[PDB]
Amino acid sequence: EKQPNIDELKKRMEQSRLNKLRGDLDQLIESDPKLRALRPHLKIDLVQEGLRIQIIDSQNRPMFKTGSAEVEPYMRDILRAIAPVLNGIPNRISLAGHTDDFPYANGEKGYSNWELSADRANASRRELVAGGLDNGKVLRVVGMAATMRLSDRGPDDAINRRISLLVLNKQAEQAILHHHHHH
Amino acid sequence: PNIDELKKRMEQSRLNKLRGDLDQLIESDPKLRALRPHLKIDLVQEGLRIQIIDSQNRPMFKTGSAEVEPYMRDILRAIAPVLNGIPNRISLAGHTDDFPYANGEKGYSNWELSADRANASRRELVAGGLDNGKVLRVVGMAATMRLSDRGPDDAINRRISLLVLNKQAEQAILHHHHHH
C-alpha cells in the first residue's frame, strides 16, 4: 500500500498518456484521406514497454524498395505526419528495423539484413526529425535483421519487412539507461 | 528454487571461465596485451560484458568513420573464436559522439555512426569465425550514454559493447523485442 500503491499510480498515469497518444495517432490517420489510404500498413498497440507503432510492408507497397535504405514517398509521408504528434508527450522513443530482403542468415560477413535493418531504422529516424520530432526524443536505434520474422517466405511474407517505433514508458526508458550504465 | 538458482550458478561459472580465458589470452599475446587498456571485461547481471573503448591517442575507428582500425579488427577477430566456444548469444551496441549534437536533424549523425560501428564490429566477429545465429541484435545508442562530458577523457564516449547473455537475459531481451 506504500511504495507499490504510489508505483501503480505512476504506472496508470503513464498508461493514460500513452493511451491518449494512441487515440491521437489513430485519429490523425483517419481524418487525413491520404494517410487513411495507408492505414493497412499501420499497426498500433499498447505493449508492456509503452506504445508500439509498426509500419509494415505489403507486397505491392514496400516502405523501402528491395535492398534499399531509401524511404519510399508514402513512407516519408507517414513518418513526417506522426512526428509532431509524437512530440505531444515527453517520452523518448526507440526505432527497430526488421528486414529479410537478403538471403536468410547468409553472407553475414558483409552487408546483410543486419546493416539494412539498422539503416532503415535510421532512415526512418531522419524522416521523423525532418517532420519535426523534438531533438533528443530518440534514445535507441536497433537492427533486428530477420530474427523476428512473422512469416516464412511466400505470398504473405511482406510482414517480415517493417519498422517499429516504440514510445517508451518511464520504466522502459529507465531499463535501457540502466542496461547501458549499470556497472 | 535451488534447481533454477543452481543452473544460474553453473552458467555464471561458465561465463566467469570465459572471462578468465579472455584475460589469459590477452595477457599471453604481446599484441593483444598492448591493447588491453582498451578492453574491459566484467561479469554483469546480464552475463558477461566486453567493452572495447577508445583512448585519446588510439581510436578503434577514425573520427566520423565506421571503418575499423587495424587493431580493432585484430581484437574482434581474436575474441570471436573464444566467444564461439560456448552456447551463449550476443548483443552488440555502439556508442559514439564523433559528430556534433546538431548533426541530428542532418543526415549522417551519431545515430548512423553508432549503428554502423556496431555492425562493422559484427562483421569482424563473423570474419573471426562466429557461429551463425549468435548475434541477437545490433544497437546504436549515439551519444545518449555518455560516460564523460566532452573534454580530457571523453574518449570513453566512443566504445563498442559486446554482451554475452545468460539465459535469463537472452529471454528478457527477446521478449522485449517481440514487443518492438
XYZ file of C-alpha atoms in Angstrom:
363
model
C 0.000 0.000 0.000
C 3.085 2.187 0.396
C 5.644 2.155 -2.437
C 3.525 -0.240 -4.554
C 0.410 1.935 -4.429
C 2.353 5.023 -5.472
C 4.125 2.830 -8.031
C 0.835 1.661 -9.541
C -0.352 5.277 -9.588
C 2.551 6.465 -11.732
C 2.181 3.411 -13.962
C -1.514 4.166 -14.554
C -0.845 7.824 -15.301
C 1.752 6.899 -17.882
C -0.610 4.391 -19.479
C -3.318 7.039 -19.735
C -0.866 9.367 -21.503
C 0.236 6.685 -23.960
C -3.358 5.613 -24.461
C -4.300 9.166 -25.396
C -1.359 9.286 -27.801
C -2.612 6.025 -29.316
C -6.041 7.514 -29.911
C -4.483 10.692 -31.281
C -2.381 8.796 -33.803
C -5.317 6.667 -34.930
C -7.358 9.860 -35.366
C -4.579 11.574 -37.342
C -4.525 8.643 -39.751
C -8.320 8.524 -40.049
C -9.009 12.197 -40.724
C -6.373 12.648 -43.455
C -7.581 10.858 -46.641
C -4.056 10.160 -47.850
C -2.885 8.754 -44.524
C -6.092 6.740 -44.211
C -5.355 5.084 -47.564
C -2.097 3.893 -45.991
C -3.688 2.561 -42.789
C -3.304 -1.104 -43.809
C 0.435 -0.555 -43.257
C -0.107 0.868 -39.779
C -0.468 -1.279 -36.662
C -0.580 0.423 -33.265
C -0.775 -1.410 -29.943
C -0.023 -0.890 -26.267
C 2.766 -3.127 -25.002
C 4.386 -3.563 -21.593
C 7.203 -1.193 -22.591
C 4.852 1.523 -23.820
C 3.168 2.259 -27.146
C 4.220 0.443 -30.312
C 3.709 1.797 -33.816
C 4.541 -0.621 -36.613
C 4.830 0.443 -40.255
C 4.615 -2.780 -42.234
C 5.180 -3.567 -45.908
C 2.577 -5.011 -48.269
C 3.938 -6.916 -51.277
C 2.792 -4.246 -53.729
C 3.728 -1.334 -51.474
C 7.058 -1.682 -49.613
C 8.221 1.181 -47.393
C 11.710 0.709 -48.878
C 12.448 -0.883 -52.249
C 14.244 -4.230 -52.096
C 17.821 -3.895 -50.895
C 17.473 -0.137 -50.379
C 17.524 2.010 -47.234
C 15.864 4.912 -49.097
C 12.310 5.658 -47.945
C 9.500 5.498 -50.475
C 7.295 8.618 -50.811
C 4.408 7.238 -48.737
C 6.822 6.076 -46.038
C 8.191 9.612 -45.772
C 4.607 10.914 -45.604
C 3.636 8.581 -42.767
C 6.730 9.324 -40.696
C 6.538 13.086 -41.163
C 2.837 13.079 -40.303
C 3.188 11.274 -36.980
C 6.330 13.153 -35.905
C 4.648 16.271 -34.447
C 2.038 14.170 -32.659
C 4.778 12.076 -31.053
C 6.015 15.377 -29.573
C 2.752 15.637 -27.634
C 4.319 13.828 -24.679
C 7.891 13.922 -23.267
C 8.516 10.193 -23.766
C 11.606 9.088 -25.655
C 11.491 6.564 -28.479
C 13.295 3.530 -29.871
C 13.342 2.557 -33.547
C 13.780 -1.037 -34.684
C 14.148 -2.359 -38.201
C 13.039 -5.842 -39.279
C 14.334 -6.949 -42.683
C 14.533 -10.108 -44.802
C 15.430 -8.616 -48.212
C 18.668 -10.593 -48.459
C 19.076 -14.396 -48.169
C 18.188 -15.520 -44.634
C 21.298 -15.557 -42.421
C 23.709 -15.741 -45.359
C 26.838 -13.846 -46.297
C 26.622 -12.141 -42.910
C 30.321 -11.405 -43.282
C 29.312 -8.433 -45.418
C 26.380 -6.021 -45.811
C 23.336 -8.076 -44.841
C 19.895 -7.844 -43.289
C 21.655 -6.545 -40.169
C 23.045 -3.453 -41.877
C 19.909 -2.973 -43.967
C 17.595 -3.227 -40.942
C 19.659 -0.698 -38.960
C 19.967 1.599 -41.967
C 16.190 1.515 -42.423
C 15.628 2.338 -38.767
C 17.931 5.345 -39.173
C 16.368 6.396 -42.474
C 13.035 6.403 -40.637
C 14.645 8.353 -37.803
C 15.777 11.058 -40.217
C 12.241 11.444 -41.593
C 10.770 11.815 -38.103
C 13.288 14.569 -37.411
C 12.552 16.238 -40.763
C 8.894 16.050 -39.794
C 9.523 17.969 -36.600
C 10.315 15.347 -33.952
C 11.837 17.156 -30.966
C 15.595 16.923 -30.601
C 16.632 14.311 -28.062
C 13.433 12.281 -28.441
C 15.208 9.258 -29.917
C 17.007 7.065 -27.383
C 17.878 3.982 -29.421
C 18.019 2.538 -32.935
C 18.080 -1.217 -33.445
C 18.744 -3.573 -36.311
C 16.993 -6.925 -35.837
C 17.691 -8.328 -39.312
C 15.269 -11.210 -39.955
C 15.465 -12.651 -36.435
C 11.864 -11.696 -35.664
C 10.199 -12.714 -38.921
C 6.448 -13.329 -38.689
C 6.182 -15.469 -41.815
C 8.227 -17.929 -43.841
C 8.965 -16.716 -47.351
C 5.917 -16.692 -49.586
C 2.998 -14.513 -50.815
C 2.359 -13.140 -47.320
C 5.934 -12.512 -46.169
C 5.772 -8.738 -46.656
C 5.094 -8.557 -42.917
C 8.737 -9.532 -42.318
C 9.752 -6.085 -43.519
C 8.643 -3.475 -41.017
C 9.780 -0.529 -38.916
C 8.769 -0.473 -35.272
C 8.570 2.766 -33.317
C 8.310 2.184 -29.568
C 7.297 5.157 -27.426
C 8.909 4.174 -24.123
C 7.179 4.469 -20.760
C 9.299 5.588 -17.775
C 10.259 2.078 -16.646
C 11.243 1.003 -20.160
C 13.392 4.102 -20.575
C 14.971 3.542 -17.162
C 15.638 -0.109 -18.016
C 17.509 0.972 -21.143
C 19.534 3.608 -19.273
C 20.374 1.035 -16.584
C 21.299 -1.525 -19.246
C 23.983 0.793 -20.620
C 25.036 2.315 -17.272
C 24.951 -0.380 -14.563
C 28.442 -1.352 -13.524
C 14.434 -22.873 -6.130
C 17.861 -24.456 -5.711
C 17.375 -26.004 -9.153
C 16.848 -22.774 -11.106
C 19.395 -20.927 -8.969
C 21.814 -23.846 -9.327
C 21.604 -23.539 -13.105
C 22.255 -19.823 -12.668
C 25.450 -20.577 -10.749
C 26.542 -23.048 -13.412
C 26.054 -20.529 -16.208
C 27.693 -17.875 -14.039
C 30.767 -20.062 -13.567
C 30.804 -20.756 -17.305
C 30.852 -17.063 -18.154
C 33.396 -16.448 -15.414
C 35.662 -19.001 -17.114
C 35.151 -17.219 -20.426
C 36.330 -14.065 -18.669
C 39.373 -15.949 -17.431
C 40.199 -17.393 -20.845
C 39.906 -13.955 -22.397
C 42.162 -12.361 -19.762
C 44.584 -15.267 -20.058
C 44.579 -14.981 -23.857
C 45.086 -11.212 -23.935
C 47.901 -11.486 -21.372
C 49.626 -14.317 -23.240
C 49.690 -12.493 -26.578
C 52.047 -9.473 -26.801
C 49.855 -7.700 -29.390
C 46.576 -8.135 -27.509
C 48.409 -7.370 -24.272
C 49.395 -3.939 -25.589
C 45.750 -3.254 -26.461
C 44.417 -4.396 -23.082
C 43.811 -0.830 -21.832
C 41.026 -0.680 -24.432
C 39.411 -3.889 -23.187
C 37.040 -4.006 -20.238
C 35.625 -7.430 -19.434
C 33.350 -7.990 -16.477
C 30.552 -10.140 -15.125
C 27.230 -8.329 -15.037
C 23.718 -9.398 -14.093
C 23.023 -9.943 -17.813
C 26.038 -12.228 -18.269
C 29.484 -11.115 -19.457
C 30.111 -7.629 -20.824
C 33.042 -6.890 -23.113
C 33.655 -3.222 -23.852
C 36.196 -2.051 -26.407
C 36.914 1.585 -25.615
C 38.785 4.382 -27.372
C 41.797 6.162 -25.911
C 42.520 9.755 -26.916
C 45.532 8.729 -28.991
C 44.162 5.434 -30.313
C 40.526 5.246 -31.540
C 39.043 1.955 -32.742
C 37.556 3.821 -35.733
C 38.876 7.065 -37.243
C 36.709 10.131 -36.496
C 33.370 10.024 -38.315
C 34.192 6.633 -39.853
C 32.708 3.155 -39.385
C 35.841 1.552 -40.859
C 37.665 -0.483 -38.215
C 41.276 0.370 -37.448
C 43.791 -2.499 -37.799
C 43.929 -3.133 -34.043
C 40.139 -3.105 -33.715
C 39.959 -5.768 -36.412
C 42.612 -7.746 -34.521
C 40.779 -7.517 -31.193
C 37.410 -8.547 -32.652
C 38.739 -11.466 -34.683
C 40.764 -12.653 -31.701
C 37.819 -12.857 -29.321
C 35.343 -14.357 -31.801
C 36.596 -17.955 -31.635
C 36.696 -17.779 -27.837
C 33.120 -16.489 -27.705
C 32.145 -19.153 -30.216
C 33.321 -21.837 -27.794
C 30.161 -21.532 -25.698
C 26.392 -21.538 -26.494
C 25.587 -18.025 -25.243
C 24.209 -15.468 -27.652
C 25.352 -11.880 -28.079
C 24.037 -8.324 -28.236
C 26.129 -5.540 -29.801
C 25.888 -1.826 -29.047
C 27.760 1.166 -30.425
C 28.299 4.449 -28.574
C 29.609 7.458 -30.484
C 29.896 11.227 -30.038
C 32.114 11.992 -33.057
C 29.547 14.296 -34.652
C 28.161 17.435 -33.003
C 24.696 17.103 -31.462
C 23.429 19.333 -34.290
C 24.072 16.584 -36.851
C 20.771 15.142 -35.671
C 18.333 16.915 -37.994
C 21.056 16.228 -40.545
C 21.684 13.060 -42.461
C 24.665 11.075 -41.203
C 24.876 11.558 -37.431
C 25.992 9.702 -34.293
C 22.903 7.529 -34.731
C 24.075 6.252 -38.099
C 27.696 6.175 -36.953
C 26.993 4.198 -33.782
C 24.820 1.622 -35.544
C 27.286 1.340 -38.412
C 30.152 0.788 -35.979
C 28.120 -1.864 -34.185
C 27.594 -3.676 -37.495
C 31.203 -3.153 -38.554
C 32.128 -4.907 -35.305
C 29.581 -7.648 -36.012
C 31.170 -8.296 -39.416
C 34.630 -8.674 -37.848
C 33.279 -11.191 -35.344
C 31.847 -13.176 -38.262
C 35.203 -12.922 -40.049
C 36.712 -14.268 -36.837
C 34.552 -17.371 -37.018
C 31.433 -16.549 -35.005
C 28.618 -19.079 -35.479
C 25.532 -18.064 -37.419
C 22.668 -17.157 -35.106
C 24.883 -15.978 -32.232
C 24.048 -12.293 -32.705
C 20.624 -11.384 -31.301
C 20.571 -7.668 -32.154
C 22.702 -4.666 -33.103
C 22.123 -1.360 -31.318
C 23.101 2.243 -31.954
C 22.947 4.481 -28.873
C 24.644 7.526 -30.421
C 25.862 9.719 -27.550
C 22.905 9.121 -25.236
C 25.020 7.042 -22.856
C 27.965 9.426 -22.462
C 30.204 8.467 -19.537
C 32.091 11.763 -19.598
C 31.355 15.341 -20.654
C 33.331 16.434 -23.745
C 36.905 17.178 -22.640
C 40.046 15.297 -21.422
C 38.824 11.725 -21.139
C 35.727 11.823 -23.350
C 37.352 9.059 -25.413
C 35.247 6.814 -23.193
C 32.197 8.096 -25.083
C 33.346 6.134 -28.122
C 33.058 2.434 -27.385
C 31.633 -0.850 -28.629
C 29.884 -3.067 -26.106
C 29.509 -6.798 -26.647
C 27.211 -8.541 -24.189
C 27.420 -12.327 -23.840
C 23.957 -13.111 -22.487
C 22.999 -15.585 -19.784
C 19.736 -17.470 -20.305
C 17.518 -15.072 -18.338
C 18.940 -12.015 -20.095
C 18.568 -13.614 -23.525
C 14.913 -14.386 -22.880
C 14.229 -10.924 -21.446
C 15.744 -9.223 -24.482
C 13.897 -11.495 -26.932
C 10.580 -10.887 -25.161
C 11.227 -7.143 -25.291
C 11.952 -7.149 -28.999
C 8.899 -9.247 -29.812
C 7.092 -6.163 -28.457
C 9.149 -3.924 -30.741
